[PDB]
Write a protein that binds this ligand. Structure first.
Ligand code: NAG
Ligand code: NAG
Ligand code: NAG
Ligand code: NAG
Length: 344
């Protein structure tokens, strides 16, 4: 079957099947000029047994790139431009079309907290203020909401969308936690007014939760409160991320991070998705136990590692980083095939 993704009780329902899912992150899948390169990559993800892919819904600039290069939006105080041309949102159309053809679903965020592919910083350059006042800057929010309608209106009736996502890792450093609560309540109400067929989520890392061991990620210095955010009425499920080598914690601490978040999602009546994770050293040894903890914890509906790597018909390879898991490699055997086999 081919249907809209919904919630069934405490779990997800994907094409009529209720139960736990595995997926992957592929930010770079959105910025390909040859659609055959998107299609070969999605053929590999589908034959591996994965069901969901996370891809970027943004590409923000203050000055247009070299002719031929991709850009989705140009931010300016004298009038901004949304690009629906061949070198614009048509490359994101390639990804939604490929998902329909290979039986996959997509999670899509609308802006980045970080400055990669523009982010909040590109809005700051155009409209003034700073990274924490962005949430309440009138001109910046008016343009963000126009960008949300331009993306949602293309795909609101496609069965390939898993969920819309407000941003990639939203933070408000040192702020009251109410700034993000009020912003997210208003923006998620707006997305639901444009599309009643699909689910909606925040995209946060999961910071700020009092049931943990007190390490920095559990404290309240980045403007977020996990229990308060997951109880917002117009959000349908919780998200959280995990990077111990950047956070100053050890690898085994990740199991407790998964368990506390899963319980907070279930106390709010909803599932959680373990949406982005990686270890810089020995990934097969250190990430495999995390995968088993998520599969066997009540309140967890799925997980997606960072990140997929692949190669094309011309012999070139995709964008890569220290966390890349290359298709058909020894780390694909340990973290993709073996995990899919344990789910079914
Ligand atoms: C950003 O702007 C507001 C002032 O309008 C200020 O309260 C806050 O301290 C500033 N942030 C930084 C990092 O300086
Ligand atoms: C598309 O989905 C909307 C709900 O978001 C629905 O009201 C509308 O009828 C659908 N369009 C078609 C052509 O069926
Ligand atoms: C992947 O490996 C299988 C052998 O296990 C092979 O048949 C297939 O052609 C390979 N695909 C790629 C893209 O390397
Ligand atoms: C490290 O972290 C936890 C506390 O955060 C500690 O209880 C555990 O024994 C340690 N794990 C390893 C293997 O270092």
């Amino acid at each position: 079957a081919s249907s809209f993704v919904t919630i069934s009780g405490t779990q997800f329902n994907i094409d009529g099947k209720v139960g736990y899912f595995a997926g992957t992150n592929c930010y770079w899948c959105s910025f390909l000029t040859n659609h055959a390169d998107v299609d070969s990559t999605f053929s590999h993800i589908s034959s591996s047994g994965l069901k969901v892919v996370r891809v970027w819904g943004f590409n923000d600039v203050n000055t247009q790139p070299s002719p031929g290069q991709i850009w989705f939006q140009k931010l300016s105080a004298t009038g901004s431009t949304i690009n629906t041309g061949a070198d614009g949102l048509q490359t994101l159309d390639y990804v939604v079309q490929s998902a329909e053809q290979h039986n996959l679903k997509l999670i899509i965020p609308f802006v980045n907290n970080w400055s990669d592919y523009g982010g909040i910083n590109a809005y700051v350059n155009a409209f003034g203020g700073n990274a924490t006042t962005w949430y309440t800057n009138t001109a910046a929010q008016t343009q963000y909401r126009k960008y949300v309608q331009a993306v949602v209106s293309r795909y609101a009736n496609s069965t390939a969308i898993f969920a819309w996502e407000l941003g990639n890792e939203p933070r408000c450093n040192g702020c009251s936690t109410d700034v993000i609560v009020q912003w997210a309540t208003s923006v998620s109400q707006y997305v639901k007014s444009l599309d009643s067929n699909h689910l909606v989520t925040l995209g946060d890392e999961g910071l700020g939760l009092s049931t943990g061991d007190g390490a920095y990620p559990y404290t309240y210095g980045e403007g977020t409160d996990f229990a308060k955010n997951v109880q917002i009425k117009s959000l349908d499920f919780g998200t959280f991320h995990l990077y111990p080598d950047s956070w100053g914690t050890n690898y085994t601490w990740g199991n407790g991070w998964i368990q506390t978040h899963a319980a907070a999602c279930l106390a709010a009546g909803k599932p959680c998705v373990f949406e982005e994770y990686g270890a810089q050293q020995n990934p097969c040894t250190n990430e495999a136990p995390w995968q088993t903890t998520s599969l066997t914890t009540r309140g967890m509906g799925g997980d997606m590692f960072w990140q997929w790597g692949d190669t094309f018909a011309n012999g070139a390879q995709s964008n890569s980083d220290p966390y890349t898991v290359w298709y058909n490699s020894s780390n694909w055997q340990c973290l993709v095939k073996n995990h899919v086999d344990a789910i079914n």
